[PDB]
Design a protein around this ligand. Structure first.
Ligand code: SIM
Length: 425
């Protein structure tokens, strides 16, 4: 029997083991993250999950925001409020800003870009190269609309992804299209006509210019007034170099070397210069906490950023059958790029406004459902919103290259565990 005036706890090996039940999925998953930090496989990570109701409000932070030791010879922690490089996780923010312009009657999604982006309309299509080493350029067929930009179906690509453009750079055509070591996302030509194929490209850099020109505000000021202010966010900016308080606390980028799998400090150009202009495809710095506030508002359909019916538009498959099948073919054949991060490498998908849409359940009732929206950012950041499950999640790393196996595996383990314990319906 228990001791007088003391709580009856476990008094021997039998009842102490039985004092608490076995470890559930989330506890086991946290141990995997702690082991990855301890064994030096990752620098650190922040993982977050929320439902609409508020009953799920889960945030865990592991490890360091850098591999560089501080003034006290320590590795400072990656925190929920640590300023991080979002890279392509910026695209969701820019998509929201575009849709607000639509709501306010400043733009129409199906109007051609010619009016606000005559500099894009005038850009030719790079068809190939001549034998002497000269670009063969031609006129675009059909018009680019704002909806082509939001769905990556405009004909635009990225220089570091398409072979025609990689050659274009090698020939010296983009020597003068860069400042502070940051290359312009507006200078390079298109590689196809609009509507022809899904191609990942500088579409949101152009869409951000459209927002600036539609509103008469620079994207930074538009961001502050229309996304940050309504959510009470004070640390989300294109202009990190103008915020000494964020600079003093920011993450460093870490890179994993292909040869020995070791983590090294990545002296990224993006952390020493903001660049002259706001690039809505890649340019925002923020904390995981503030990014989750964006995801959560969208999940809740609380009208703080967009009207609920406009948010619903983001989750609708935007691609006609021909493009849907071409995008899926491309993505299935490109696991070395892997736009979908932790998702199964073969999956029926479409593209919405702001990310990839799952057209089927990822694993029946165990994980993300049909209708879920997702994308990511370079440093292994992955976000998703799942209206059917009533969940949104984010996994924030500051580690390149994209599609790192350790990060992807941990991210999958995180989501699986959260869905197993907390998914509803
Ligand atoms: C500039 C990087 C960008 C496009 C904003 C970005 O976040 O896309 C990420 C997001 C992810 C969902 C899909 C991606 C598709 C293709 C790439 C492997 C890309 C990461 C490339 C990056 O590791 C190297 C660049 O940073 C080079 C440069 O900036 O010149 C990666």
């Amino acid at each position: 029997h228990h001791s007088s005036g003391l709580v009856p706890r476990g008094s021997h090996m039998g009842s102490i083991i039985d004092a608490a039940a076995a470890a559930g999925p989330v506890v086991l998953m946290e141990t995997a993250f702690r082991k990855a930090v301890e064994s030096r496989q990752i620098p650190g990570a922040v993982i977050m999950a929320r439902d609409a109701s508020g009953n799920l409000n889960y945030t865990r932070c592991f490890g360091a925001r850098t591999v560089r030791r501080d003034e006290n010879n320590q590795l400072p922690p990656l925190q929920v409020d640590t300023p991080c490089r979002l890279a392509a996780a910026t695209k969701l923010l820019t998509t929201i800003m575009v849709l607000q312009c639509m709501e306010r009657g400043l733009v129409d999604l199906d109007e051609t870009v010619d009016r606000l982006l005559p500099d894009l309309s005038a850009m030719p299509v790079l068809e190939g190269f001549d034998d002497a080493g000269n670009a063969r350029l031609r006129e675009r067929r059909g018009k680019i609309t704002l909806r082509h930009l939001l769905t990556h179906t405009s004909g635009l690509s990225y220089v570091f992804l398409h072979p025609l453009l990689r050659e274009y750079m090698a020939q010296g055509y983009l020597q003068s299209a860069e400042k502070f070591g940051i290359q312009s996302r507006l200078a390079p030509p298109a590689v196809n006509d609009p509507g022809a194929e899904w191609i990942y490209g500088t579409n949101l850099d152009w869409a951000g210019k459209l927002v600036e020109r539609a509103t008469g505000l620079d994207l930074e000021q538009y961001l502050q007034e229309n996304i940050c202010a309504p959510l009470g966010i004070t640390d989300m900016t294109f202009k990190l170099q103008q915020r000494p308080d964020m600079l003093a606390r920011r993450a460093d980028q870490t890179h994993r070397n292909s040869a020995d799998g070791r983590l090294r400090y990545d002296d990224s150009v993006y952390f020493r210069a903001d660049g002259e202009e706001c690039f809505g495809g890649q340019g925002v710095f923020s904390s995981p906490g503030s990014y989750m506030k964006v995801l959560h508002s969208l999940l809740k359909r609380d009208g703080l950023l967009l009207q609920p019916q406009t948010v619903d538009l983001m989750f609708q498959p935007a691609l006609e059958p021909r493009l849907e099948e071409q995008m899926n073919q491309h993505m299935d054949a490109s696991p070395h790029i892997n736009y979908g991060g932790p998702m199964p490498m073969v999956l029926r998908r479409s593209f919405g406004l702001g990310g990839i849409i799952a057209l089927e359940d990822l694993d029946g009732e165990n994980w993300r459902r049909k209708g879920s929206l997702t994308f990511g950012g370079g440093p292994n950041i992955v976000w998703q919103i799942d209206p059917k499950a009533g969940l949104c999640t984010l996994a924030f790393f500051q580690l390149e290259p994209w599609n790192d196996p350790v990060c992807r595996d941990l991210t999958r383990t995180f989501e699986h565990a959260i869905y197993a314990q907390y998914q509803q319906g």
